[PDB]
Design a protein around this motif. Sequence first.
Motif, mmCIF file in Angstrom:
data_model
loop_
_atom_site.group_PDB
_atom_site.id
_atom_site.type_symbol
_atom_site.label_atom_id
_atom_site.label_comp_id
_atom_site.label_asym_id
_atom_site.label_seq_id
_atom_site.Cartn_x
_atom_site.Cartn_y
_atom_site.Cartn_z
ATOM 1 N N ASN A 1 -0.984 8.879 6.094
ATOM 2 C CA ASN A 1 -1.259 9.087 4.622
ATOM 3 C C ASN A 1 -2.388 9.990 4.200
ATOM 4 O O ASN A 1 -2.924 10.825 3.535
ATOM 5 N N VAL A 2 -3.587 9.522 5.477
ATOM 6 C CA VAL A 2 -4.752 10.260 5.377
ATOM 7 C C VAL A 2 -4.774 10.914 6.498
ATOM 8 O O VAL A 2 -5.778 10.330 7.705
ATOM 9 N N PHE B 1 -12.128 1.569 -0.772
ATOM 10 C CA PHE B 1 -10.564 1.852 0.205
ATOM 11 C C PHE B 1 -10.466 3.583 -0.721
ATOM 12 O O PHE B 1 -10.758 4.673 0.870
ATOM 13 N N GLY B 2 -10.670 4.130 -1.713
ATOM 14 C CA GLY B 2 -10.127 5.352 -1.912
ATOM 15 C C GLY B 2 -11.094 5.740 -1.935
ATOM 16 O O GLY B 2 -11.515 7.606 -1.328
ATOM 17 N N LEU C 1 -5.103 2.583 -9.028
ATOM 18 C CA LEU C 1 -4.663 3.953 -8.057
ATOM 19 C C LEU C 1 -3.132 3.939 -8.224
ATOM 20 O O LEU C 1 -1.902 3.836 -8.293
ATOM 21 N N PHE D 1 -3.920 -1.160 -5.488
ATOM 22 C CA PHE D 1 -4.577 -0.781 -6.215
ATOM 23 C C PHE D 1 -4.644 -1.304 -7.550
ATOM 24 O O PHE D 1 -3.727 -0.169 -8.079
ATOM 25 N N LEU E 1 2.764 2.571 -3.510
ATOM 26 C CA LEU E 1 2.017 3.051 -2.548
ATOM 27 C C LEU E 1 1.721 3.897 -2.072
ATOM 28 O O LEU E 1 1.835 4.611 -1.604
ATOM 29 N N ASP F 1 -11.426 6.287 4.339
ATOM 30 C CA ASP F 1 -10.591 6.817 4.872
ATOM 31 C C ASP F 1 -10.579 9.038 4.178
ATOM 32 O O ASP F 1 -11.105 9.340 5.668
ATOM 33 N N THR F 2 -10.494 9.171 3.127
ATOM 34 C CA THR F 2 -10.316 10.198 2.849
ATOM 35 C C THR F 2 -12.019 10.667 3.085
ATOM 36 O O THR F 2 -11.825 12.100 3.571
ATOM 37 N N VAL G 1 0.842 11.167 -1.006
ATOM 38 C CA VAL G 1 1.207 9.929 -1.988
ATOM 39 C C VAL G 1 2.339 9.968 -1.825
ATOM 40 O O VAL G 1 3.538 10.677 -1.914
ATOM 41 N N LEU H 1 3.547 -2.970 1.342
ATOM 42 C CA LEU H 1 1.915 -2.633 1.697
ATOM 43 C C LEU H 1 1.559 -2.614 0.327
ATOM 44 O O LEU H 1 0.694 -3.028 -0.094
HETATM 45 C C1 LIG Z 1 -2.900 1.562 2.763
HETATM 46 C C2 LIG Z 1 -4.558 2.129 2.457
HETATM 47 O O1 LIG Z 1 -4.765 0.612 3.567
HETATM 48 C C3 LIG Z 1 -5.103 3.024 2.339
HETATM 49 C C4 LIG Z 1 -3.697 3.448 0.803
HETATM 50 C C5 LIG Z 1 -4.325 5.335 0.230
HETATM 51 C C6 LIG Z 1 -5.771 5.357 -0.380
HETATM 52 C C7 LIG Z 1 -7.002 4.486 -0.194
HETATM 53 C C8 LIG Z 1 -6.337 7.175 -1.172
HETATM 54 C C9 LIG Z 1 -5.405 7.821 -0.978
HETATM 55 C C10 LIG Z 1 -3.790 6.840 -0.964
HETATM 56 C C11 LIG Z 1 -3.534 6.275 0.370
HETATM 57 C C12 LIG Z 1 -3.763 7.489 1.070
HETATM 58 C C13 LIG Z 1 -1.981 5.310 0.141
#
Ligand SMILES: CC(=O)/C=C/C1=C(C)CCCC1(C)C
Length: 396
Positions: A383-384, A233-234, A87, A84, A72, A237-238, A283, A78
């Motif tokens: 990551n984001v 979550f997906g 994912l 997930f 991940l 943030d994105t 990723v 983590l």
């Molecule tokens: C660690 C965390 O809380 C978030 C993980 C992630 C998400 C939900 C979107 C695609 C991949 C990533 C960016 C690792």
Amino acid sequence: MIPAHVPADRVVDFDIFNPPGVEQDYFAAWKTLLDGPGLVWSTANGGHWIAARGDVVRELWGDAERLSSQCLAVTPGLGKVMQFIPLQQDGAEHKAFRTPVMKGLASRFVVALEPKVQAVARKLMESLRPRGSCDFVSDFAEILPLNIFLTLIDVPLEDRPRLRQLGVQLTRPDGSMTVEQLKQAADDYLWPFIEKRMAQPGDDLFSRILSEPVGGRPWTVDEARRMCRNLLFGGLDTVAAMIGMVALHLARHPEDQRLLRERPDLIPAAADELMRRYPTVAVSRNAVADVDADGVTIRKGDLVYLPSVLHNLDPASFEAPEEVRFDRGLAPIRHTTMGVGAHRCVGAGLARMEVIVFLREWLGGMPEFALAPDKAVTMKGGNVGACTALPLVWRA
Ligand SMILES: CC(=O)/C=C/C1=C(C)CCCC1(C)C
Ligand code: HEM
């Protein structure tokens, strides 16, 4: 010390949580790895590979069989925790779980969701328009992704205000609460929604997914826990980063702002080009088999980091990548914003709609905005990638 199988010329120290200059400009920061080998080994963060040229980024990201999505992240512990679904799954497991989740996010459903997701975007817009200014990140980008979530699972309207606060803590900052507590907090947030809909399925997102089988059998309670969390979550943030970079784009190109208020029939295409233009997701994978690439070998065990921006914005993979132009004829799946291969965002279709609807409401209802004169724009890494501050002004 460096492992034998990693040539010393490929050694860097690039730290993926702070590329230097990331605060000023996310993309240039990453783009410096273009002047170097196509696949390098970073000594930071416990030692890993970073893909650093679009062919390498793209080819490795498709190798779902030899590159597992299970670690991940590069931060130990983590992946173990969040788990997930889908994912973080491989092979057949991942095939089984992806099918009904995907089917939950099918075109006709995104399409059906349009009106409702627009009104949400509009309502937020209207709560800001009288102000003549705003910190767009903290007032808009960080707030719409959860609102839409509320609307995707269709919570009854009375609850939305109470549920937005509950939710705000976890969209998201960092931020001195363990990986474990974070997951506990989102399960606790999510659970009530899950009970209701495994019991009385409705016609919202979760119900739809939860009534489909998984390779023939019904979802266990934990799988739904894992898969919902993953949708939450997906989607936060994105989307925020994206909506952020798009509002960025426009504050810095007022001519697009006019092109777009004049030719609102051009919004779909501009979304697709903006989304190709500003991708900030990255990723990790973990090598389960030895993989040859760019004339070198990654060994079972090795972690690999894949910045999508080194594909989309690599001039070796796309002509004038930094130009927002309308004559590429590029299908979105041809670039790596939403990923590539088996793991490619289920939420693609939805994101794209999301952005479009934002453009439609943000350009229609708002007047001509610009960047503030005496407040910087700053971004963050990880990551984001995203802006962490976007001060915008306009005559109310
Ligand atoms: C660690 C965390 O809380 C978030 C993980 C992630 C998400 C939900 C979107 C695609 C991949 C990533 C960016 C690792
Ligand atoms: C800003 C819009 C989005 C961006 C840039 C984005 C980015 C991505 C990327 C790059 C992946 C592939 C990850 C990988 O291969 O490791 C992914 C997958 C995923 N996304 Fe998104 N995403 C977006 C929106 C959403 C939305 C709106 C949702 C759902 C509500 C969502 C849920 C998921 C899930 C569950 C996966 C995993 C798919 C699998 O393994 O089969 N994402 N997203």
